[PDB]
Write a protein that binds this ligand. Structure first.
Ligand SMILES: CCCCCCCCCCCCCCCCCC(=O)OC[C@H](COP(=O)([O-])OCC(O)COP(=O)([O-])OC[C@@H](COC(=O)CCCCCCCCCCCCCCCCC)OC(=O)CCCCCCCCCCCCCCCCC)OC(=O)CCCCCCCCCCCCCCCCC
Ligand SMILES: CCCCCCCCCCCCCCCCCC(=O)OC[C@H](COP(=O)([O-])OCC[N+](C)(C)C)OC(=O)CCCCCCCCCCCCCCCCC
Ligand SMILES: CCCCCCCCCCCCCCCCCC(=O)OC[C@H](COP(=O)([O-])OCC[N+](C)(C)C)OC(=O)CCCCCCCCCCCCCCCCC
Ligand SMILES: CCCCCCCCCCCCCCCCCC(=O)OC[C@H](COP(=O)(O)OCCN)OC(=O)CCCCCCCCCCCCCCCCC
Ligand SMILES: CCCCCCCCCCCCCCCCCC(=O)OC[C@H](COP(=O)(O)OCCN)OC(=O)CCCCCCCCCCCCCCCCC
Ligand SMILES: CCCCCCCCCCCCCCCCCC(=O)OC[C@H](COP(=O)(O)OCCN)OC(=O)CCCCCCCCCCCCCCCCC
Ligand SMILES: CCCCCCCCCCCCO[C@@H]1O[C@H](CO)[C@@H](O[C@H]2O[C@H](CO)[C@@H](O)[C@H](O)[C@H]2O)[C@H](O)[C@H]1O
Ligand SMILES: CCCCCCCCCCCCO[C@@H]1O[C@H](CO)[C@@H](O[C@H]2O[C@H](CO)[C@@H](O)[C@H](O)[C@H]2O)[C@H](O)[C@H]1O
Ligand SMILES: CCCCCCCCCCCCO[C@@H]1O[C@H](CO)[C@@H](O[C@H]2O[C@H](CO)[C@@H](O)[C@H](O)[C@H]2O)[C@H](O)[C@H]1O
Ligand SMILES: CCCCCCCCCCCCO[C@@H]1O[C@H](CO)[C@@H](O[C@H]2O[C@H](CO)[C@@H](O)[C@H](O)[C@H]2O)[C@H](O)[C@H]1O
Ligand code: SF4
Lengths: 83, 114, 98, 51, 115, 96, 174, 318, 70, 97, 155
C-alpha cells in the first residue's frame, strides 16, 4: 500500500489532471453495478410505448390479459409514479 | 398479372370526425377509455388481414363510435372542453403539462355528467 | 432505376477513372480514393433509407470509419514518400522496376 | 536476358538500402521586420524557418 | 424551403457587400501597391514553397479521433434502449479504447512536434 | 435535481405517447379510406387517358401476388398537381 | 422544379467529382470534394437521413482540412494548377462536364435515359414511401442500435481504430 | 413573412456586431485606465458607423500574386456562414427549428474554417500562409474535445434539438451538474472563435495580421464582422447550453430579455479575458487540449453515459 | 467613468433582443395567434397535414372544435 | 461463411443484419418485408439451383418491390399519354387533380 | 440640386474618414516613444477613433516617427505604396521633417518628403505627445476640408 500510496501522492503533485480523469472514469465503470436504481433504467425504457399495442384475439383462455385498458390485469406503472 | 380490386367511392363514404389534432389530443385519454371495443376490433382486423380493403366495415364503426363519443361531450361538457383544447392548441408542441388547470375542469365535468 | 442512381453511379465511375489515371501528385490520387468512398456512402445511404432497412442505417457510418483508416494510412505513406524524395510525385517510386 | 530497354538496369543494393538523396528540403526565408510590431520598426530580422 | 431561402439570403447579402466594396471606392492600381507584403522588403522565394508541418502525426491522429465522435454522437439515442446492459458496456468499451489509443500515442512521444 | 426532473419528463413522455396510441385507430381508419379513395380516382382517369392505347389493360398489377401492396408515392399521387406532390414527398423534411 | 431537388443536387455532386478527379492542385481538389460532401449531405438529407447527411459532411470537412495542411507541406509547387492552366486537366474537366451535360439533357428530355443501364427520369420522388406517422426517426433508431445489436461491429471498429494509431506511429517512424 | 423574419435576424446581428466593436474598445479602454471612443458621437456611439463607412469607401486591393477567385470567395464564406450559424438559435423560438441543430452548428463551424484557410492560401504571401496553417493547428486542437464536450451535456438533455435544452434546464441550470464541462466548453469557444489568448491565426505581434494581412477595405470588413458575429453567437450557444432561461409560452419576451442579458455578460467576459492574459504559443494550445481537456473530457463522457443509467434519470428521446 | 460604457451596451442589448422578439411575434401572426406548430417527427407532421385538410381553408392553424361535429 | 464458427458456437456475430425481414429495433418493418419473407420461405432448404427456377415468381415480386422498375415504366406510359392528349386538347383532368 | 447633395455627401465621407484614422504600426526611433505616450492613457488616441493596425493594407495614415536612413528608405516607400487610398503621411520630429540632428550625415535621408508626400509636419525633437496629437487633429481638419465630390460634380 505504501508504494501505491506514495505513487498516488506523487501523481497528485505532478499530474492532478490525469488523477481526476482516472478517478472519474473509474466511477463510471464501477458505480452502475453498485447502484440500486440501475434496474429502473431498463424498466422505464421498457415502459415507453413507441409502438401500438396490437390486441390479441380473445381465444377464450388468456385470463391474465386485460379486456379493457382500465381492467386490473396487465403491467402497471404504479412503481413509476412513486419514483 | 391481374387487376387490383378497389372499393367504389360509394363504399368508402362515412361521416367524418372533422376536428383538429388539438381537439383529438385533449379528448384522447377519455376517447381511449370509452371507444376501446370498436377501436381494438379494427386494429386486430388490420394486423390480421394486412389489407385496408378487408377492414372497411370495422373502420366505419370506429368513426361512428368516435362521433358518438364527441356528441356526448357536446351535450354535457361543451364549455369545459372548449377551454381545455383551446389551451392545448396554443402550445406549439401541444403539451399536456401546460394545461393542467383546464384539464382538471374538463376531467371533473365528464366524471360528474358521465 | 430512379434517376438519382444515375448520377451517383456516374460519380463513382468518375472517381474510379480519376484514381486509375494518375498525374504526378500522389495526393491528387488519394483525393480520388476519398471521393470513391463518398459516392459509396451516398449510394449506400440512399438504398438503405429508401427501403426502410432500419438496422442497415449504421452501415454507412461504419463505412466512414474505415474510410478514415484508409485515408490516415494513405497520408502516413505520403509523409514517408515526401521525406525520401522531397515531393509526393509518383514517378519517384520506380526503384522496384529492377 | 539483356535487351536495349533494360540496358540501364543495375542489380539492387545487397542489403536493400538505397543511398539517401541529397535533395534539399529548403527552409522558408522570411523578412521579419522592419515594419513589424515586434521588430521595433528598424530590425530586418532575416529568418530561415522550417514550419 | 425556409432553410434554402435563409442560406441564399445570407450569402446573397455577403456577396452584395463585396460588390459594393469593389465598385464604390476610387481605385488607383499600380505595380508597387499590389506587390506582396513582407514588412517593406521583397520576399525571398515564393510563398508556394513547401511549408513543413511539425504536427503531422497529430493531424493524422485527428482523422482517426474525429471518426470516433461519429461513433459516439448516437449515444443519447442508444441510451433509450431496453438492452442497457449491452449498450453501457459497449459504450464504455469504445471510449476506453479511445483513451488507450491516446495514452499510447502520448507515451510513445507521438504528441510532441518534430524538432 | 436532474434525476428527478428527467424522471418527470419520462412520465410526461409516456402520457404523450399514450394519447397517440388512443387516436391511432381513428387515424388508421381515415388513412385507409383516403388511400383507397385516392387510388380509385387514379384508376378512373387511367381509364380515359389510356382508352385508345392498344394493349393497355387499365388497373393491371405489376406483381404476380394478389396480396395487398402499399402504393409508392408515384402511384398514389401519379396525376396530381405538383404542389400537393411536393407537400406529400418533401413536406415533412422541409418543415423548418 | 423543386420536385427535382435531389436530381439537381446529384448533378452538382458529379460536377464536384469531375472537379477533383481531373486532379488540379490538391488545394482545388479539396474544394471540389467539399462541395460534393455538402450536396451529398443534401441528397442524403432529402431521403430522411439528417444524421447521416450531416455526419458525412462533418467527417469530410475535418478530412479535407488535414489534406489542406499536408498539401501546403508535401504536395505544392511554385504554380499550383487550376483547371484552366493545364491541357490534360482542362481536357478531363471538359470531357466530364460534357458527358454529364448530355446525360442530364437527355434524361430530362425523355423523362428517362439509357446510359449503359436504364434509368427512369420521372423525378426521384416517385419511389418514396407513402404512409408513415411514427413518433421517432427511423434512421436514428437504426444508428442507435449499433450499441445493442452491433456489439460485434463495435469491437472490430474499435480495435481497427486503435490499431490505426499504432500503425501510423510505426509507419512514420523512420 | 418569413423573408421579413430573416431580415429581422441578420440586420440586428450586423447592428449588434457593429456596437460590440464599440463596447470592446470602451471595455478594454477602461481596464487600461483610459476611455476608448468618446468623441465620434456622444460616448462614441457613432464610432462604429464611421468605421464601417470608412472601410467600404476605402480602396480594395487584389494582390498581384493572389488567386483571384479564392481571394474573393473566402470573405463571402466567412460572413455568409457567420449569419447561417444564427438561424437555429432558440430565442426562445428558432427561425429554423432543426432536429439536429447542434450537429448543424458543428458542421457550419467546421466549414467556416475554410474561409481562413482559403483566404490565407489565396493571398499567396508568407504571413498569410503562416496564419492559415495556424488555423489548421487550432482546429485540430479543439474540434475533437468540443464535440465530445457537447455530447456529455446532451446526455442530460436527450436530443440534438436546441429547444430541448430549454426544457432540460427548466428547473436548474446545467452549469450546476456540469460545471467541469462548462469550464472546458468556455475555453474551447475561445479557441473556436480565434480569441485571446488563442488569437493565433491573426497573432498581430507575431504575424502582423496573419491570414487577413493582404485584405483591405470592404473585404477586410467582412472578416471582421464574421468574427464578432461568431463571438456573440458562440456566447449565445453557451448561455443556452449551461445557463438555460425559463420560457413562458405566453410571455416569450421575458425569456428574450433574460436570455439577452446572459448572452451579453458572457460576451463581456470574452472582452475581459482579452484584457487580462498573454497569448498562448500555438503548439502549447494543442497540448492544452490534447493532454489536459481530452483526457478529462473522455473520462467525463464516460461518467455522463453512466450517470443517467445508474441514477435512473435518462432524459426522454422526444 | 465606467458607466459611460453602458450606452453602447444598451444599444447592443436592444439589437440582440429584436431577433428573438420579432421571431416570436411573426410566428403568432402567421399561425392565428398561437405558437408555430413544431413537427419534429412524422406523426406530428401527419396531424398537421390532417389539420390542413380539416380546416377547410388549407390552413393547418385554423382549428375546428365541437361546432364542426354534427 | 467459409468456416461456420457462428453456427457451431451458437453466437450471432453478423447474421442479425443480413436480411431486412429480421428483427428490427421497435419492430419497424422494411418496405419490402412481406416480399422478402415470401421469397426467403419459398427458397428455404431447397438450394440455389432449385430456388433459381422454383421461386422465380417470388423473387420477381421481391425485385419489383426493391427497385420498382416495372411500376415506373407503367407510370411513365400514363404520364406520356396524358401529356400527349392534353396538348392535342383531347383530355381535361378532373377538378381534384 | 446636385450641388447641395454632393456637398452633404462630401461631409459624410470626410466625417467617416477623419473619425476613423488607422495609423500604420510603424515607428523608427525616439519619436516613436512619444507616439507610444499618445496611445497611453493620458491622451488615449483611441478615444478619437485613432487605432494602430500593423498591416499597411488596413492603415490610413503613416506616421514617420523618427530618422529615415538611406538603408531604410526603400522599405518606407514600399509600405507606403502598399497602403490603399486615401492615405496620409504625418512627418513627426526634426529627423523625419528635414534630417534634424543628423542632417549632414552620409547615411540619412534629409527629410522623409524626399521619399513620400507629406500632409502634416509635427516639429520637435521629439514633439511632445500632445504636440503629435495636435498634428493628428490638424490632419483631421485637413480631411474635413476635402472637396472630392464637389470637384467631381464640376468636372
Ligand atoms: C460567390 C462566388 C465567389 C467567388 C467569386 C469568383 C469571381 C471573383 C472575380 C475574379 O475572379 O476576379 C477577376 C478574375 C479576372 O482577373 P485576372 O487576375 O486577370 O484572372 C484571374 C485568373 O486568371 C483566374 O482566377 P483564379 O486563379 O482564381 O482561377 C480561376 C478559377 C478556375 O476556374 C476553372 O479553372 C474552371 C471552373 C472551375 C469551377 C467549376 C467547378 C469546379 C469543380 C467544383 C464544383 C463546384 C461547382 C460550382 O479558380 C477556381 O477554382 C474558382 C473556385 C470557385 C469556387 C466556388 C465555390 C463553389 O476573374 C475573371 O474575371 C475571369
Ligand atoms: C449613414 C449616415 C450616418 C450619419 C452620420 C452622422 C454624422 C454626425 C456628425 O457629423 O457628428 C457631428 C459633427 C461634429 O463636428 P466635428 O467632427 O467637426 O467636431 C470636432 C471634434 N470636437 C467637436 C470634439 C471638437 O458635426 C459636424 O461636424 C458636421 C458633419 C456633417 C456630416 C455629414 C452629415 C450628412
Ligand atoms: C456595412 C456596410 C457599409 C456600407 C457603406 C456604404 C457607403 C455609404 C456612404 C456612401 C457615400 C457616397 C459614396 C462616395 C464615395 C465614392 C468614392 C470616392 O470618393 O471617389 C471620389 C471620386 C472623385 O473622382 P474624380 O473624377 O474627381 O477624380 C478621380 C480621378 N483622378 C484620380 C484622376 C483625379 O468621385 C467619383 O468619381 C464619383 C462620386 C460619385 C458619388 C455617388 C456615388 C455613386 C456610387 C455608385 C458607383 C457605381 C458602381 C456601383 C457601386 C455600388 C453602389 C452602391
Ligand atoms: C458583338 C460584339 C459586342 C462586344 C461588346 C463588348 C465590347 C467591349 C468594348 C471594350 C472597351 C474597352 C474598355 C477598356 C476598359 O474597360 O478598361 C478601362 C477601365 C479601367 O480603368 P482605367 O481606364 O484603366 O483607369 C482608371 C482606373 N481607376 O475599365 C476596366 O477595364 C475594368 C473592368 C472591370 C471588369 C468588368 C468587366
Ligand atoms: C466550397 C464553397 C462553399 C460554399 C458554402 C455555401 C453554403 C453551404 C451551406 C452548407 C450546405 C449544407 C446544408 C445542409 C443543411 C442541413 C440542415 C438540416 O439538417 O436541417 C434541414 C432540414 C431537416 O430538418 P430536420 O429538423 O433535420 O428533420 C426533419 C423535420 N423537419 O431540411 C431542410 O431544411 C431542407 C434541406 C434540403 C436542401 C439542403 C441543401 C444542402 C445542399 C448543399 C447546399
Ligand atoms: C470570475 C470571472 C469569471 C469569468 C468568466 C465569465 C463568467 C460570466 C458568466 C455570465 C453569466 C452570469 C449569470 C447570468 C445572470 C443573469 C441573471 C438574469 O438576468 O436572469 C435571472 C436568472 C434567473 O432566471 P432563470 O435563468 O430563467 O431560472 C433558471 C430556470 N431555467 O438568474 C438569476 O440570477
Ligand atoms: C484516485 C485513484 C486513481 C488514481 C489513478 C492515477 C493514474 C495516473 C497514471 C499516470 C499519469 C501520470 O503521468 C506520468 O506517469 C508516470 C508513470 O507512468 C509518472 O512517473 C512515475 O514513473 C514510475 C512509475 O511508473 C516511477 O518509478 C516514478 O518514480 C514515477 O514518477 C509521472 O509522474 C507522470 O508524468
Ligand atoms: C480495453 C477493454 C476495456 C473494456 C471495458 C468494459 C467496461 C465494462 C464495465 C461494466 C459496465 C456495465 O456494468 C453493468 O451495467 C448494467 C447496466 O448497463 C447493470 O445492469 C443492471 O441495470 C440494468 C438496467 O440498466 C438491468 O437491465 C440489469 O438487470 C441490472 O443488472 C449491471 O448491474 C452492471 O454490472
Ligand atoms: C478513459 C478516459 C479517462 C482516462 C484518461 C485517458 C488518457 C490517459 C493518458 C495517460 C498518459 C500517460 O503517459 C504519459 O507519457 C509521458 C511520456 O512521454 C509522461 O511524461 C511526459 O509527459 C508529461 C506531460 O507531457 C511531462 O510532464 C513529463 O515531463 C514527460 O516526461 C506523461 O506524464 C504521461 O502522462
Ligand atoms: C452550376 C451548375 C448548375 C447545374 C444544375 C443542373 C440542374 C439540372 C436540370 C434540372 C431541371 C429540371 O427541370 C424540371 O423538369 C420538370 C419537367 O416536368 C418541370 O416540371 C414540370 O411539371 C409539369 C409537367 O406537366 C409542368 O406543368 C410544369 O410547368 C413543370 O414545372 C420542372 O418545372 C423543371 O424544373
Ligand atoms: S526628431 Fe529627435 S526624438 Fe525624433 S527620432 Fe530624431 S533625434 Fe529622436
Amino acid at each position: 500500500a505504501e508504494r501505491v500510496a506514495a505513487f498516488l501522492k506523487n501523481v497528485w503533485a505532478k499530474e492532478p489532471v490525469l488523477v481526476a480523469s482516472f478517478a472519474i472514469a473509474g466511477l463510471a465503470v464501477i458505480l452502475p453495478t453498485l447502484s440500486p436504481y440501475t434496474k429502473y433504467s431498463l424498466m422505464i425504457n421498457r415502459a415507453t410505448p413507441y409502438n401500438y399495442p396490437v390486441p390479441l384475439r380473445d381465444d377464450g383462455n388468456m385470463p391474465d390479459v386485460p379486456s379493457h385498458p382500465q381492467d386490473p390485469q396487465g403491467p402497471s406503472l404504479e412503481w413509476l409514479k412513486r419514483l | 398479372p391481374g387487376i387490383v380490386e378497389l372499393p367504389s367511392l360509394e363504399d368508402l363514404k362515412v361521416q367524418e370526425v372533422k376536428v383538429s389534432s388539438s381537439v383529438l389530443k385533449a379528448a384522447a385519454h377519455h376517447y381511449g377509455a370509452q371507444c376501446d371495443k370498436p377501436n381494438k376490433e379494427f386494429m386486430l382486423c388490420r394486423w390480421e388481414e394486412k389489407d385496408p380493403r378487408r377492414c372497411l366495415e370495422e373502420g366505419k364503426l370506429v368513426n361512428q363510435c368516435a362521433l358518438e363519443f364527441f356528441r356526448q361531450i357536446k351535450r354535457h361538457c361543451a364549455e369545459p372542453f372548449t377551454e381545455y383544447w383551446t389551451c392545448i392548441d396554443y402550445s406549439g408542441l401541444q403539451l399536456f403539462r401546460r394545461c393542467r388547470k383546464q384539464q382538471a375542469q374538463f376531467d371533473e365535468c365528464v366524471l360528474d355528467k358521465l | 432505376m430512379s434517376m438519382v442512381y444515375m448520377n451517383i453511379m456516374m460519380a463513382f465511375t468518375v472517381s474510379l477513372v480519376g484514381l486509375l489515371m494518375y498525374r504526378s501528385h500522389l495526393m491528387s490520387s488519394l483525393l480520388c480514393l476519398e471521393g470513391m468512398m463518398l459516392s459509396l456512402f451516398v449510394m449506400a445511404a440512399l438504398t438503405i433509407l429508401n427501403s426502410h432497412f432500419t438496422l442497415a442505417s449504421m452501415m454507412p457510418i461504419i463505412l466512414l470509419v474505415f474510410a478514415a483508416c484508409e485515408a490516415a494510412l494513405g497520408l502516413s505513406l505520403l509523409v514517408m514518400v515526401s521525406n525520401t524524395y522531397g515531393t509526393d510525385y509518383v514517378q519517384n517510386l520506380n526503384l522496384l522496376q529492377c | 536476358y539483356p535487351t536495349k530497354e533494360t540496358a540501364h538496369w543495375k542489380p539492387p543494393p545487397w542489403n536493400d538500402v538505397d543511398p539517401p538523396k541529397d535533395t534539399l528540403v529548403s527552409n522558408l526565408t522570411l523578412n521579419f521586420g522592419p515594419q513589424h510590431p515586434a521588430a521595433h520598426g528598424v530590425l530586418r530580422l532575416v529568418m530561415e524557418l522550417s514550419g | 424551403m425556409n432553410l434554402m431561402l435563409a442560406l441564399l439570403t445570407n450569402f446573397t447579402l455577403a456577396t452584395l457587400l463585396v460588390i459594393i466594396a469593389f465598385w464604390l471606392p476610387q481605385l488607383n492600381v499600380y505595380s508597387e501597391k499590389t506587390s506582396p507584403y513582407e514588412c517593406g522588403f521583397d520576399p525571398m522565394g515564393s510563398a508556394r514553397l513547401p511549408f513543413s508541418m511539425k504536427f503531422f502525426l497529430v493531424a493524422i491522429t485527428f482523422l482517426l479521433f474525429d471518426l470516433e465522435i461519429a461513433l459516439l454522437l448516437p449515444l443519447p439515442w442508444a441510451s433509450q434502449t431496453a438492452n442497457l446492459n449491452t449498450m453501457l458496456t459497449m459504450a464504455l468499451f469504445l471510449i476506453i479504447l479511445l483513451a488507450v489509443s491516446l495514452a499510447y500515442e502520448w507515451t510513445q512521444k507521438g504528441l510532441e512536434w518534430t524538432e | 435535481s436532474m434525476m428527478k426532473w428527467n424522471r418527470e419528463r419520462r412520465r410526461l413522455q409516456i402520457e404523450d405517447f399514450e394519447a397517440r396510441i388512443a387516436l391511432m385507430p381513428l387515424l388508421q381508419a381515415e388513412k385507409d379510406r383516403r388511400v383507397l379513395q385516392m387510388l380509385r380516382e387514379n384508376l378512373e382517369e387511367e381509364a380515359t387517358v389510356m382508352k385508345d392505347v392498344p394493349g393497355w389493360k387499365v388497373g393491371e398489377s405489376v406483381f404476380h401476388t394478389t396480396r395487398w401492396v402499399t402504393p409508392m408515392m408515384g402511384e398514389l399521387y401519379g396525376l396530381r398537381a405538383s404542389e400537393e406532390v411536393l407537400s406529400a414527398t418533401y413536406g415533412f423534411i422541409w418543415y423548418t | 422544379m423543386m420536385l427535382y431537388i435531389v436530381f439537381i443536387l446529384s448533378v452538382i455532386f458529379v460536377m464536384g467529382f469531375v472537379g477533383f478527379s481531373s486532379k488540379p492542385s490538391p488545394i482545388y481538389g479539396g474544394l471540389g470534394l467539399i462541395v460534393s460532401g455538402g450536396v451529398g449531405c443534401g441528397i442524403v438529407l432529402n431521403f430522411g437521413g439528417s444524421f447521416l447527411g450531416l455526419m458525412v459532411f462533418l467527417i469530410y470537412l475535418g478530412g479535407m482540412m488535414v489534406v489542406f495542411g499536408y498539401t501546403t507541406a508535401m504536395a505544392t509547387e511554385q504554380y499550383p494548377e487550376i483547371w484552366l492552366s493545364n491541357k490534360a486537366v482542362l481536357g478531363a474537366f471538359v470531357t466530364g462536364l460534357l458527358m454529364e451535360f448530355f446525360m442530364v439533357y437527355y434524361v430530362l428530355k425523355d423523362k428517362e435515359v439509357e446510359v449503359v443501364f436504364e434509368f427512369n427520369g420521372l423525378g426521384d420522388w416517385v419511389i418514396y414511401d407513402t404512409g408513415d406517422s411514427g413518433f421517432f426517426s427511423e434512421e436514428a433508431m437504426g444508428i442507435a442500435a449499433l450499441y445493442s445489436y452491433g456489439t460485434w461491429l463495435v469491437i472490430v471498429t474499435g480495435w481497427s481504430l486503435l490499431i490505426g494509431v499504432v500503425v501510423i506511429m510505426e509507419i512514420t517512424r523512420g | 413573412m418569413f423573408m421579413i423574419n430573416i431580415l429581422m435576424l441578420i440586420i440586428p446581428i450586423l447592428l449588434a456586431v457593429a456596437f460590440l466593436t464599440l463596447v470592446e474598445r470602451k471595455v478594454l479602454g477602461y481596464m487600461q485606465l483610459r476611455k476608448g471612443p468618446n468623441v465620434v458621437g456622444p460616448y462614441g456611439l457613432l464610432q462604429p458607423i464611421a468605421d464601417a463607412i470608412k472601410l467600404f469607401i476605402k480602396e480594395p486591393l487584389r494582390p498581384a500574386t493572389s488567386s483571384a477567385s479564392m481571394f474573393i470567395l473566402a470573405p463571402i464564406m466567412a460572413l455568409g456562414l457567420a449569419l447561417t450559424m444564427w438561424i437555429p438559435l432558440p430565442m426562445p423560438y428558432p427561425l429554423i427549428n432543426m432536429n439536429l441543430g447542434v450537429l448543424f452548428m458543428l458542421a457550419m463551424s467546421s466549414l467556416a474554417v475554410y474561409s481562413i484557410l482559403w483566404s490565407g492560401w489565396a493571398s499567396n504571401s508568407k504571413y498569410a500562409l503562416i496564419g492559415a496553417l495556424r488555423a489548421v493547428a487550432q482546429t485540430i486542437s479543439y474540434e475533437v474535445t468540443l464535440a465530445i464536450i457537447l455530447l456529455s451535456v446532451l446526455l442530460m438533455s436527450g436530443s440534438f434539438t436546441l429547444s430541448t435544452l430549454i426544457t432540460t434546464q427548466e428547473q436548474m441550470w446545467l452549469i450546476l451538474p456540469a460545471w467541469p464541462l462548462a469550464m472546458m466548453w468556455f475555453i474551447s469557444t475561445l479557441a473556436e472563435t480565434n480569441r485571446a489568448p488563442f488569437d493565433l491565426t491573426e497573432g498581430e505581434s507575431e504575424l502582423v495580421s496573419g491570414f487577413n494581412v493582404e485584405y483591405a477595405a470592404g473585404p477586410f470588413a467582412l472578416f471582421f464582422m464574421a468574427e464578432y458575429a461568431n463571438i456573440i453567437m458562440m456566447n449565445i450557444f453557451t448561455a443556452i447550453l449551461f445557463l438555460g432561461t425559463s420560457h413562458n409560452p405566453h410571455m416569450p419576451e421575458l425569456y428574450t430579455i433574460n436570455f439577452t442579458i446572459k448572452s451579453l455578460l458572457l460576451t463581456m467576459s470574452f472582452l475581459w479575458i482579452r484584457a487580462s492574459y498573454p497569448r498562448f504559443r500555438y503548439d502549447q494550445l494543442m497540448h492544452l487540449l490534447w493532454k489536459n481537456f481530452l483526457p478529462l473530457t473522455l473520462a467525463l463522457c464516460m461518467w455522463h453515459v453512466s450517470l443517467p443509467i445508474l441514477t435512473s434519470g435518462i432524459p426522454p428521446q422526444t | 467613468m465606467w458607466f459611460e460604457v453602458l450606452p453602447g451596451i444598451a444599444v447592443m442589448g436592444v439589437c440582440l433582443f429584436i431577433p428573438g422578439m420579432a421571431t416570436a411575434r411573426i410566428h403568432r401572426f402567421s399561425n392565428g395567434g398561437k405558437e408555430k406548430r413544431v413537427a419534429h417527427y412524422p406523426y406530428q407532421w401527419y396531424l398537421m397535414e390532417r389539420d390542413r385538410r380539416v380546416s377547410g381553408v388549407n390552413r393547418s392553424y385554423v382549428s375546428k372544435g365541437l361546432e364542426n361535429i354534427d | 461463411p467459409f468456416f461456420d464458427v457462428q453456427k457451431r458456437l451458437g453466437v450471432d456475430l453478423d447474421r442479425w443484419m443480413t436480411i431486412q425481414s429480421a428483427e428490427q429495433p421497435h419492430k419497424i418493418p422494411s418496405r419490402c418485408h412481406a416480399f422478402e419473407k415470401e421469397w426467403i420461405e419459398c427458397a428455404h432448404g431447397i438450394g440455389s439451383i432449385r430456388a433459381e427456377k422454383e421461386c422465380k415468381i417470388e423473387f420477381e415480386d421481391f425485385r419489383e418491390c426493391l427497385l420498382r422498375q416495372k411500376t415506373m415504366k407503367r407510370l411513365h406510359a400514363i404520364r406520356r399519354q396524358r401529356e400527349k392528349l392534353i396538348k392535342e386538347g383531347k383530355y381535361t383532368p378532373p377538378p381534384h387533380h | 440640386r446636385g450641388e447641395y447633395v454632393v456637398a452633404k455627401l462630401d461631409d459624410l465621407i470626410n466625417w467617416a474618414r477623419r473619425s476613423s484614422l488607422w495609423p500604420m504600426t510603424f515607428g523608427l526611433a525616439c519619436c516613436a516613444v512619444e507616439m507610444m505616450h499618445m496611445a497611453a492613457p493620458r491622451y488615449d488616441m483611441d478615444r478619437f477613433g485613432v487605432v494602430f493596425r500593423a498591416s499597411p493594407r488596413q492603415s490610413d495614415v503613416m506616421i514617420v516617427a523618427g530618422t529615415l536612413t538611406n538603408k531604410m528608405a526603400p522599405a518606407l516607400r514600399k509600405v507606403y505604396d502598399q497602403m490603399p487610398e486615401p492615405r496620409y503621411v504625418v512627418s513627426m520630429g526634426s529627423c523625419a521633417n528635414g534630417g534634424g540632428y543628423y542632417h549632414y550625415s552620409y547615411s540619412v535621408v534629409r527629410g522623409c518628403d524626399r521619399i513620400v508626400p507629406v500632409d502634416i509636419y509635427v516639429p520637435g525633437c521629439p514633439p511632445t505627445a500632445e504636440a503629435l496629437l495636435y498634428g493628428i487633429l490638424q490632419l483631421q481638419k485637413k480631411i474635413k476640408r476635402e472637396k472630392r465630390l464637389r470637384i467631381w460634380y464640376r468636372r
